[PDB]
Amino acid sequence: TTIVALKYPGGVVMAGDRRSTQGNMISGRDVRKVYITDDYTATGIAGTAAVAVEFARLYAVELEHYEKLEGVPLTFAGKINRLAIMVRGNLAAAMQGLLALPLLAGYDIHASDPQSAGRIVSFDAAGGWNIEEEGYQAVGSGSLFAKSSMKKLYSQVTDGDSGLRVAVEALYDAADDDSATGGPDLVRGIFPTAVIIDADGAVDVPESRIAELARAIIESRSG
Amino acid sequence: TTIVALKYPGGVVMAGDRRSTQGNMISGRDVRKVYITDDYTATGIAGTAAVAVEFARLYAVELEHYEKLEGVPLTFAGKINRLAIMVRGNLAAAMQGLLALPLLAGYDIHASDPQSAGRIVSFDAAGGWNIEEEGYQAVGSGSLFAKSSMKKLYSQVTDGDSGLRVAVEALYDAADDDSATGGPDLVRGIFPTAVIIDADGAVDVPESRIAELARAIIESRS
Amino acid sequence: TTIVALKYPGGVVMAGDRRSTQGNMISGRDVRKVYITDDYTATGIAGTAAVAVEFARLYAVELEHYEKLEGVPLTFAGKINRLAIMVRGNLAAAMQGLLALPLLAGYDIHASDPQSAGRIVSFDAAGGWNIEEEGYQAVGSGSLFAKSSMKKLYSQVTDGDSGLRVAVEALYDAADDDSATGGPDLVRGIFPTAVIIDADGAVDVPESRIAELARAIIESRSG
Amino acid sequence: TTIVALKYPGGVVMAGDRRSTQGNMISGRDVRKVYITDDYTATGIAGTAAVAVEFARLYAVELEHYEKLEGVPLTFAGKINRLAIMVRGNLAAAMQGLLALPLLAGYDIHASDPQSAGRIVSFDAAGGWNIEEEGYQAVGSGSLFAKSSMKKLYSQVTDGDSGLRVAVEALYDAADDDSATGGPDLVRGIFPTAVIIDADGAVDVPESRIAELARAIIESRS
Amino acid sequence: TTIVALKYPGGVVMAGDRRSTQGNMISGRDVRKVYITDDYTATGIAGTAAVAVEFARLYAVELEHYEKLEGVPLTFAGKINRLAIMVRGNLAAAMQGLLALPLLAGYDIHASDPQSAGRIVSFDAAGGWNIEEEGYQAVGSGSLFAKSSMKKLYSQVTDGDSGLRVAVEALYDAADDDSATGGPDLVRGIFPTAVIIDADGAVDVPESRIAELARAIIESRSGADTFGSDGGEK
Amino acid sequence: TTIVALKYPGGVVMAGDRRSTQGNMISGRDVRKVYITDDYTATGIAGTAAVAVEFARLYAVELEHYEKLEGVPLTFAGKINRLAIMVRGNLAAAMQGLLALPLLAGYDIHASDPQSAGRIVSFDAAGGWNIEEEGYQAVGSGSLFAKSSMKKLYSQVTDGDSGLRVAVEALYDAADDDSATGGPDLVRGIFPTAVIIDADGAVDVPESRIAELARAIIESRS
Amino acid sequence: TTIVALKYPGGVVMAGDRRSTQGNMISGRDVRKVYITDDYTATGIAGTAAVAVEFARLYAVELEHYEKLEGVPLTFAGKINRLAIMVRGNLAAAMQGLLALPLLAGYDIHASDPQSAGRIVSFDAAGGWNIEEEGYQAVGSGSLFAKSSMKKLYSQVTDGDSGLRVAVEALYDAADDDSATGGPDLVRGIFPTAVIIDADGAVDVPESRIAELARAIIESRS
Amino acid sequence: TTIVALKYPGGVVMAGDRRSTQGNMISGRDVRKVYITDDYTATGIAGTAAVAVEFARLYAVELEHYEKLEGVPLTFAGKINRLAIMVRGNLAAAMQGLLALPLLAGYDIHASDPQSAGRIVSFDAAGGWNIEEEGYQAVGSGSLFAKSSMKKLYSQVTDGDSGLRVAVEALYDAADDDSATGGPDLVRGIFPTAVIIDADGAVDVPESRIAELARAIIESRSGADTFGSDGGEK
Amino acid sequence: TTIVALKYPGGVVMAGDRRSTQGNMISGRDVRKVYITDDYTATGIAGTAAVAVEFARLYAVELEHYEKLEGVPLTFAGKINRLAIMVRGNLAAAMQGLLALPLLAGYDIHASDPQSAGRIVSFDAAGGWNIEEEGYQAVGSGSLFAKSSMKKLYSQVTDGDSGLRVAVEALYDAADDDSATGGPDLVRGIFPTAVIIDADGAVDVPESRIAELARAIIESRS
């Protein structure tokens, strides 16, 4: 599994692969790992698939429950604290083989500067959180390769489209160097899923655009 | 890793993949796992790459040493016995995580019927050997998927080219269902290697033929 | 044990073998492993036989209990969630040897297109569920061989009868490659059980049809 | 794996199944487990397949080596002693999962009464041996079922043909109650192998007769 | 310990041996292992003797308690479920050396065909139950030999008497191949106990009939040994 | 991680590094480890980063809660006791790997002499606390090197500016001798964070002054 | 520790860092990890420093011994085989923590095309070796980051100078992401060491050129 | 135990403490830990005392044996290699608690520049060696404190006397921060031992010079403590 | 750590060292280990510093709590019983590495003879208490050396001053033979603390008197 998130002027984009494996055997080819928790945040979770799905569902339920109870959505730091508390509480299960590491990307509406309202938060196994100030972050087995690719490709990010292309290329590199991460499957037409968040909210990227970007990257690397 | 071998009328063909991994990390993309030990036998070894290369080299050295010393090549049963002895002697190291399971394909010149002179021999971790009578066998992590694919596809084998196509398709299925087995890499132009053995000896299949077969299979499945 | 399920236009069919073993000794020859939990779903469970029977009974009781209490049956995703919860709760006992891996197939009456209303759901040991999109799935010791056979045979499925024949042939292959899976016993006249679900509900396949299909397959492979 | 042997007036017969498994997965369908060590004895070995093959080969080599060196074959007691010594020496490796339990059947040319010259010898894991006096014995995973079937069926043994039928039926029962023992494969046409030993020596039973007996048994139980 | 049960037209018969051992020592010679839980079911339990007796008593108490409370006896499947629940509950004690494997035989008064109303149920260590429909079943250490003997002898069963003879012969074979199972003791006059269930209920078999059957079986075996040989050698 | 604190005439200064690591990999470059708990105390915590942040937040919340409830801030000894109790209660988690060692520096308004109101308190894993009377203290992996540098550089401290320079140089030495402690990153413009406490309360040192001091130290050692 | 190697038209280059650590403590700042084994091959060894130095010394001694004895240097395959044998023989001691993973770069004078005479060979802990065909390879703790940086930067390599700059930048990235790898120390004037091999042989790169390249990279990334 | 060695223009100096402990108990107060192996090298060993003495004795014997056999002393690299081989061969016994870490200081007569002929070599437990380039090194339990003190005090080293004073002060700091290192004992008159190597060979420093240097250091420390304050309070 | 207590005509004197260590490193130089629990008893606790401080604080709180509740101070035996109960209850924590061994010295107001009213009580790890009748006792790592010194020096005790000198000399000997015990620091001017208890209560000994005694002892032994 590999999930990447990066900031661009005016928003943030998160993308993830589609492969789930049980050892060396491939058990899934269309797993979705990026979820829209609310109108302005997206969460990607790596590790055990069942724990990831349960975590995303519970986190979305908790956020919506607070919003309905109080009539006002939580602040971004409050959402970070809730996710960190959940990760800290899952420590005993993580030590038993049910580890789940989330990745939070969101748009801060209350931020003073709309062009710097994108936020990326990374979590560790002990529940600690850190707000990324370098503009990109990745989680999963292929996270290191994706981060090293983004370190060189981040100078090309100028808007949403370029950021999406860079994220797709980072996922392609991660799948190229990690067997647990699946690359663009042209035979079955299965492509990574992406979410773009801006001032108008979080929307899902259509599959056609991601397919076009993946084909362009493959053609560029073929010669 | 996955290595397949199947019999066709008049010969035998063996093919293997190119991927080698260290856990979940891909460390090799062009490893050659099928060797031509002599003029009529080919050996594919799965497991640890270092042990596989060492075993292939030592086995070829031993066979050529006997042939030069005695002036006559060993019989097929003798080659089977020597390979089984090597596998049996490697048991202690295999129990430490250095397992290596070879697959042997050959063309018996001393066989009575030329059309049934192909031979496929499989080996287990205890050194036991068994001559396969179903006409196909596979070894490696993805061996089960390739064997099950060949079970359905073996009815289409009537010559060397059809057998090569079936072997390539079986390797494609094994790589499709196993992450440790590499499929045809179209971006880098890396394709599985194959060896065809017949009455005229053992030759390496050119890369262009395997590339054409792999592209045909990919177009068929898309 | 081996249980197979596959989708055909307008429905879904699930079949399972009849053999239970205690190590190498054969203890049962007519075990039924496919249950009709309600009018539009069928459940096949592999692993320990006692745990499978208890799971099927408890799951059917829970579904009927909810339907009677609320006056309306659960949605398909609700049934999936309840089964996943049961599997997740059984994890501690599964680690001790009482492992149970279910397989759920159903027909969604609320689905948009009637011809694509068939559903197949697979579960893992951690409770993770995945709605299968390939059109077939299998569980049990001989699951791999049956799945590989269905991969090559699924192109022939065009209606309920062809799908049933493909399922029977996949079970035959699984029994041919797995000693823990029982094949068609012609001496005792014992054949695998199958269930077909369509718009009219779930019905049991009569033994005569399955016996005829098994004899046809055996005669096909004998020459 | 299941190997049976029973005595009939004027000789002895030994039969064994053909299946070899690796856990629950079937790996072999035509394994031959009964060997003709010399002109008047046959040896069937259960357990690990590789160890069984190696034991049979080494035992035959040792017996033939002694016969060539001395110009006179070993007495039956000497053969029993050598096999027991081999089993005793294999104890340390058997404790590591390489167990091999042989079954020895032979015809004693030097015996007084020719009609009772048949001999059946069983072995344990500690190397001990015992000459059976009840007329039948079996080894392997399905040995108990085969012996319990032969206990009821032994009263019908009056000649070589009836003894062969009883042995085939016992193997059928063992395969019926045990998954590790393969039954008659009518689809593939694979049947258990048998060896008949009498005053004229040890010969291999033709496959057609065993197929006829198996089909008769199946029709009887259908 | 070995308990056998087989179906005959019109009923069912269950029999068990009389020996209890502590290792290689023989600690008991007249232990009774077949119980009449109610008017139409009999239960035999193998394993630890104390756990077997406690299980039989508790199961009978539970069945009679339900019958008295509700005024109607449980259905056969209900009794099967209660016994399976008890076996499943005893899993922790079984893992510590207190295993008890029961064997349930009964007559279903509510069954459609009176001649096929007999039922035999077998249980495993995990509490799973399977209604045996091949006509016979056995439990205990010598269960395999008795089951294999019944496989060859079941074709002779035509009524209650033949079924009882087959059960006694199966127990004799099991004791012949198992040291932990006691055989017919002619010196002390101790014979296995049997229960026959039919449309009129479950009744204990008198010892005289079982003694006669055991003597006939022993005489037949001795005569066969006299007639038989080791392929021509005695 | 390395956090240093030292007393100067009229107050106290505490500084810490910015690097967090996961084994050998560098995962953080702008981590803040010095917190202003209230108007006159600053707390720096070393060890696991998550536990440090949680402890700082909980300690500040508890102090403010007591102040709001009673209408009067806790005495310095009361704050020491609360922090020691928290450390003692975290012992079980620390033995499992979640170890956190805090360092407390504060200004005592109720002290007799204003010039000697600076306070430095050190803690151990067992919850024991000691008020340092030597003028400096350091915690973390690089604590030994920083303390040994401060032992030689403390004679130059005469006011807040010289004390801040000495603290920055001690952090530079700790980073120079320890890989887990990050030095002044001139490429990214990241410098250690410091807090100065005096009679007017606790304030954060602007980054420009610390950058100037670090550049001066680097020029001195070049 | 990080040692990189990459191929450029007409030669090959290898560079390594200078830091040696003991846990989180920095124990060495001017360690040399790249050795010139002979006139056309260079070897860099990662892992335990003592084992690396001993391996380099012994390997150079063996190569020179063979060259002096036979009057002709070993072929490149022979050198690869000897290094693989040494790595395989060190497996038992590596299991105790004395691990050494070498990287071999050389120039094949017997190669047909002079522009493709460069060779890069990597080794695993089991003694297996693989001739890299993608043009670059790295070993050590920071090997992954350096390799991923070279993957992006390899398109700029056209001659020796560009290859040297790319190798220096890859080492800079590896030090930037790994704390066990030392970066260019401008305060002490310590820079990574590099070796360039071409048709004229292997020579050590002067420190001034590497210092200029490192300063250019630092100013580029500032 | 703490042994220090630093370079000065024209030579090298090595010094060590005198205390040996068995846990928290003081067992020795006048242990000599710096040996003159030959005319131009000095070796100090930290760790177990017995292993240290045996190491120094065997190393000196080996060097003298080679010099007598060949008629020419070993080069400095040869001595380093022999000591590294000894350390590597002692690894198995060091893993059982018999650890010995040597420190080597020497004066290479074959070096080009006479003023930079001093050499300091440090060894690890795996037998690896490194020629120090910073001009000072220390080994022992208190090595970190002595090395950190020398890092600050090395700017004052201009000749042999100043280097000796710096080494004595580093040992004083190491003893001040480590309980296993013994400080100058004024009551018993026991002081650290030092060896200084120059172009004329290796000689032992007389005890009076070290005693007066230690006394001056103690007086300076006491005066600084009197002058200083805890940020305003004493 | 070492704490000594001895009886002199008319009272009792208790003294202790000032050093706290973490293995071989010295972490504290002015630790106070003798506490005035109430007007007529003093308690010295050895072992872990945190446990000792907590024990002293809790014991003083309990004694004052009882005195305030009942309006009458506890008898000496009641204080002994409470301290023994606390020590016994701390057994589980002591077995895990948090051992604390106290030493109680007091003056009995209700005793018959004023000149023999001094009391010394020692405790073991199991909570057992014993009223010492030998006239002196010591606890800590250097307790044996201090007790052996007092065994020879106790004949010189005739009043409070001589007893204080003997206690100081015993502490000096304990520090002389034990590295974990701190001796008189004449560079920093740190000396052991002492408490003198008599009919007028318990008073802390001024540092000047102890410094004079320590200097006299050092000059005597020089």
Residue numbers in the entry:
A (entry chain P), C (entry chain J): 301 to 523
B (entry chain M), D (entry chain H), F (entry chain R), G (entry chain S), I (entry chain L): 301 to 522
E (entry chain U), H (entry chain W): 301 to 534
Sentences from the paper on this structure:
The initial 2D and 3D image processing scheme visualized a class with Mpa-bound proteasome in addition to a class containing uncapped 20S CP. The structure of Mpa bound to the 20S CP that was determined without applying any symmetry, revealed a 6-edged, star-shaped density originating from a hexameric Mpa bound to the heptameric α-ring of the 20S CP. The structure of the 20S CP particle was determined by focused refinement using a binary mask for this region and was resolved at 2.8 Å resolution. Our structure of the substrate-engaged proteasome resolves the interaction between Mpa and the gate of the 20S CP. It demonstrates that the C-terminal extensions of Mpa containing the terminal GQYL motifs are able to adopt a conformation facing outside of the Mpa pore, and that their GQYL motifs occupy the binding pockets between the proteasome α-ring subunits upon complex formation. Although the α-ring subunits lack the N-terminal seven residues in the open-gate 20S CP, we still observed a slight increase in proteasomal gate diameter on the Mpa-bound side compared to the Mpa-free side, which is indicative of the conformational change undergone by the proteasomal α-rings upon insertion of the GQYL motifs into the α-ring binding pockets. Densities for the GQYL motif were resolved in all seven pockets due to averaging resulting from the inherent D7 symmetry of the 20S CP. We tentatively assigned six GQYL motifs based on their proximity to the respective Mpa protomers. The last GQYL motif was not assigned to any of the Mpa protomers and was included as a separate chain in the model.
